[PDB]
């Protein structure tokens, strides 16, 4: 394990001491027991001293069970009995929440292993084994502090507090207080809104997702002394805990009955504070599938102030309360809880370190915690600023902890061997062939010590991680799903985007710089990390950059939404997607676009071919580009604050699909180039209204379909083929030469660049399969596809 | 606390005196105990006197504790123990109602403090700790208020009043029933309509939400004493509560059975009055899901005149029940319950001043109450004109009480210091470094008393508040939502509307004066408190004033609806803007327009382009402006009663969106102006149909792009950028000079003033992120964006 208390460790070594002192050169449980009592009067030792066992009494018994002498100090270590007692003790401290293991637990574990020599020692010296395990437990368990005693009060409190529930005020007078770090400025604003008797109900709106609950412990403190008014003193804060309500309930009627009981006791009115977390569920308002309607009792209660309560709500929730104005608006009144500022994130992260140090990585590295924050606003980008954060931390706060125990130095070969020994040995004795197992046995246990010696030399991988979450690591984990390898991803985004988009350097650099500015963790998420228009017609490199943006920008290929503007005109998907004349935009705003981005807020959102849609759609979208939010889909709020908005457009097609070739000269090629590098940048404005486009962070231009583009199309198709074949376990690569023979059947002037897929099928798929079937090449072998002197040739390598 | 009775206080001071008299210059609880009994025969004192203890007996133990000497004082104050006894008594009086703590509670609090100097004195002088708390409980005094009674009897009346649900008359025969302030004129209207034995059912219709419930106590008082019909003499008034019915029930079948029992009990018939609040739920008729249908039993009960009852329903509720008929018709007959208005408001406030003087804030300030009302009407706006009001007083009626208990004068620094002391001291002794903690220890308590002395200088913040809710406070609290900084918001409304609409003063003053006059409670509170038409082009000042109106009239810009009337005739979009529009005028009345304002009555409702709308829509808008309410959309009533209805126009647009050119003059922007401050007053007649438009309270005038508005548009856009960045905690400001560098890229003759957003991104957004990235500027540093040499310049400021 690692991380134990003194008393424990001390009890353990004393066994070995007695090993030799009593002649039992192997420390069985008799010596562990002895160890407990030989630590004198520690919790183990002391326990044994209660039941009637001196250090003396044990070692003599111990000595009477393996005899004396048989010593020579022949490698006096534990044996498996003694090892069992230890395995148990660790859990006997885990049980008590200890991330350490002390004396008590060692006797507790000893008892657990209540057969073997220890067991016989205690049962011979007039001590019942469980009487001993009792005794240790009831002295001390886990080590902790923060406690106080003396004091009682109140009578009226009786009916309420039984039910349902713990009283927040209590635990902070018990010296079990936790701050909890908010979101401090929120707490002050509650008491104006609370110590009323007319609209006395606060309602906190933020995100889930801010750690709302942090603000709440604030209240506790102020409710005691003295901020709340003079005869509004003697306030108590009772939380209406959902967990207690569901407990003992198994029906809708029963759930209502529990709420009724709370309401009946609520007669403590106007001087009682009820805390309702996630307020919406009880009101049941809004939606097409509302929640249980507590609202009938709650509405007059809220208005009366008998239910003088505090509501904890989020981004979306509020709409469904102001709709039932005013008795949840003659009660309600709002106060601002953050869309978390970066700094608030950091302190939460730091706070939860020691328990990811139970996953034993984090605590630390500092920059890496910071990485969780800084990286989260732009890179994942999938929740709210602290939820995101902590995930980056702990993922990496385990990732390396996984990398930890993979090998000894490289002495993984030792373990492999030690296995092989057993086999030889075993089967040889199974014939017997006594000594024909023997030397193999001897070789085995030799091996074993080497194995274990260099695997606990890979305690260096513990000291590596067991306080470190790595900079690069936190970032790496953020890159993995969807500091260093996110900020290297950020800084070098352009480098990453160039390796997957061939041509359209114009486009790449434009996205790169706009995203990288935002993406440096220096732009608030409340607008896409990049808004963009991706110009050129379909087939010019637009989408491919969006994809490449997911890889570079997000650190993995994952997360890309994609919405068609052409459907929001009912004439390109009015009969390819279900609906009628009064549909299509209602599907997009009302459902598709907003729902999709709620799943991954990260996503490169591609609202394609924006010319086709009328400009009116663009106004709706415009709110996405500016605000970073839309509220649609039954009042849900979708964070496009983390998205990259990419609007593609119907731009310039004729040149921007024109190929090089010789049209008049060998300078018709260099006139497809210069011409395409002109044609995007004037065609863009014609493909849309300006109102959409200005709220876009750089206007990305993608140019033509050169000749030159043909051999780039072959290299897009062949790579998609060979990769879907990788799941089989085929490792394939195409040389440029092999893409050339494929081009031989697709330099058609009359059928374009379409035949290339078919010719890839013929020359790659079909050819690889015709080489695998013959056993010329194999799966797992790396397969190079080349053309030799004009004819394609398939070669194999490792 | 703030309130205690003599006996309590007397017990307390006597403790200190006896402390030192016996040689204890620290007043232990041992002296508090002594104190209790040294106050002779008060309930604490008496209690101890029962158990066999005199003040003498206590002091003897006390002298056997510290004893002589310690009569040299210590500036004798309490012990931490003694401070505990006081905190406990407070709760020991709360639990017995009392928030004006008496003697009993002090001995009770001693018991509570069941370990300590007292505790052991009392447990040493041979009396149980609990025998003492008993004795105090079993005699009360200073927990009552004086009421009447001298005997109790009943007859046939027994089964009914038991059940379910208590009678107003009983508590008013003890003469402890409240008036209530009301809604007094409402009570009168009942007595023809109720003292029938036929259609004897009054049915109160108002806002809920106005204090309808006030009227009910009205009846109680007048049916008892003393001049009323012989009809209403020989009657009983019984209140029926929904809460009791639901209690002990969790199914519909059980609820009906209980209701059957009630119906049987109506056998007090033709002389019994049943009060049913929220009457509608029981009849169960109408709706899309109705409610539980008591009506089968209840309907003949009303017809027979056995059930003579009082119905409490709201604006909207009634229609689908008189729709049932005709014993419903021969039951009900209507009476007017207060529709929210300013004069009525004030009277409620004043009435509940003294009762929110439980908050030692409000009662009063007079100006503050009036303000609460007047301010509420304009600044949220959402609720009802008197509910809003009382909430501000009580809101504020804690708000300054918060500012109370957080001051030392500026000696907040003391507390900070006193902490630091402990640290030094503590850590030093932990090394020990005994006297190296000592002097630090001594320095601590020097500080401490000084600290505490200046924390109790903030009894001056009590003397501020304990009957004065602060005028300014009410305003602050309304500003918290959305007199002084709301009536300065009101008075200076014009100034406030002017500051966000630059130019177009013509418009500003027109809106300003009409609302600012009106909202002082001097214009109809059942019609939009300003109606306006906003003419101009599309945009340019129109909407922007509506926003500025929200701020000035309502307190923040977040008080602005905005609905397009052209959708309520729709013939443009159906799949690119809005989902399912057909039915169109029906869509607005029947649903959408009304629903939106029903969400927020706290809004400048801006109904755009009623000019380009079906003629029915203008009629619909006309109802909003006249009635102030519309009842549609499931028979719900939408209060436009504290909205500002603003109907927009843009049929003169071209001149009103014209731009300056030279031609012959550089006074061409100021000749684009002169044309436009004319062009609106001609766009009115051309736009609309007359029947609607004339209800408008002023014709609001706007302008164009000119040369001149353009450079004002750059300053609107740059502010949208910097503000969404504030959320992360970037403090940004642009000087005019940086907005100038941006303008450099968007004063095109042929690409509009649309490029300005994009160029704001390049020169502001992009620039801030590229200045944060190199560490020149920072979050929470105020960041000035300038030009100072014809090129951009980065400054830092606090």
Swiss-Prot record, chains A, B:
<feature type="domain" description="Clp R">
    <location>
        <begin position="1"/>
        <end position="142"/>
    </location>
</feature>
<dbReference type="Pfam" id="PF10431">
    <property type="entry name" value="ClpB_D2-small"/>
</dbReference>
<dbReference type="Pfam" id="PF02861">
    <property type="entry name" value="Clp_N"/>
</dbReference>
<feature type="region of interest" description="I">
    <location>
        <begin position="161"/>
        <end position="408"/>
    </location>
</feature>
<feature type="binding site">
    <location>
        <begin position="206"/>
        <end position="213"/>
    </location>
    <ligand>
        <name>ATP</name>
    </ligand>
</feature>
<dbReference type="GO" id="GO:0016887">
    <property type="term" value="F:ATP hydrolysis activity"/>
</dbReference>
<dbReference type="InterPro" id="IPR001270">
    <property type="entry name" value="ClpA/B"/>
</dbReference>
<dbReference type="GO" id="GO:0030420">
    <property type="term" value="P:establishment of competence for transformation"/>
</dbReference>
<dbReference type="InterPro" id="IPR028299">
    <property type="entry name" value="ClpA/B_CS2"/>
</dbReference>
<dbReference type="InterPro" id="IPR003593">
    <property type="entry name" value="AAA+_ATPase"/>
</dbReference>
<dbReference type="InterPro" id="IPR001943">
    <property type="entry name" value="UVR_dom"/>
</dbReference>
<comment type="function">
    <text>Competence gene repressor; required for cell growth at high temperature. Negative regulator of comK expression. May interact with MecA to negatively regulate comK.</text>
</comment>
<dbReference type="InterPro" id="IPR018368">
    <property type="entry name" value="ClpA/B_CS1"/>
</dbReference>
<dbReference type="InterPro" id="IPR036628">
    <property type="entry name" value="Clp_N_dom_sf"/>
</dbReference>
<keyword id="KW-0677">Repeat</keyword>
<feature type="domain" description="UVR">
    <location>
        <begin position="415"/>
        <end position="450"/>
    </location>
</feature>
<keyword id="KW-0804">Transcription</keyword>
<keyword id="KW-0678">Repressor</keyword>
<keyword id="KW-0067">ATP-binding</keyword>
<dbReference type="InterPro" id="IPR050130">
    <property type="entry name" value="ClpA_ClpB"/>
</dbReference>
<dbReference type="GO" id="GO:0005524">
    <property type="term" value="F:ATP binding"/>
</dbReference>
<comment type="similarity">
    <text>Belongs to the ClpA/ClpB family. ClpC subfamily.</text>
</comment>
<dbReference type="Pfam" id="PF17871">
    <property type="entry name" value="AAA_lid_9"/>
</dbReference>
<keyword id="KW-0178">Competence</keyword>
<dbReference type="Pfam" id="PF07724">
    <property type="entry name" value="AAA_2"/>
</dbReference>
<dbReference type="InterPro" id="IPR041546">
    <property type="entry name" value="ClpA/ClpB_AAA_lid"/>
</dbReference>
<dbReference type="InterPro" id="IPR003959">
    <property type="entry name" value="ATPase_AAA_core"/>
</dbReference>
<feature type="region of interest" description="Repeat 1">
    <location>
        <begin position="4"/>
        <end position="69"/>
    </location>
</feature>
<protein>
    <recommendedName>
        <fullName>Negative regulator of genetic competence ClpC/MecB</fullName>
    </recommendedName>
</protein>
<dbReference type="InterPro" id="IPR027417">
    <property type="entry name" value="P-loop_NTPase"/>
</dbReference>
<keyword id="KW-0143">Chaperone</keyword>
<feature type="binding site">
    <location>
        <begin position="536"/>
        <end position="543"/>
    </location>
    <ligand>
        <name>ATP</name>
    </ligand>
</feature>
<dbReference type="Pfam" id="PF00004">
    <property type="entry name" value="AAA"/>
</dbReference>
<keyword id="KW-0805">Transcription regulation</keyword>
<feature type="region of interest" description="Repeat 2">
    <location>
        <begin position="78"/>
        <end position="142"/>
    </location>
</feature>
<dbReference type="InterPro" id="IPR004176">
    <property type="entry name" value="Clp_R_dom"/>
</dbReference>
<dbReference type="InterPro" id="IPR019489">
    <property type="entry name" value="Clp_ATPase_C"/>
</dbReference>
<keyword id="KW-0547">Nucleotide-binding</keyword>
<feature type="region of interest" description="II">
    <location>
        <begin position="469"/>
        <end position="653"/>
    </location>
</feature>
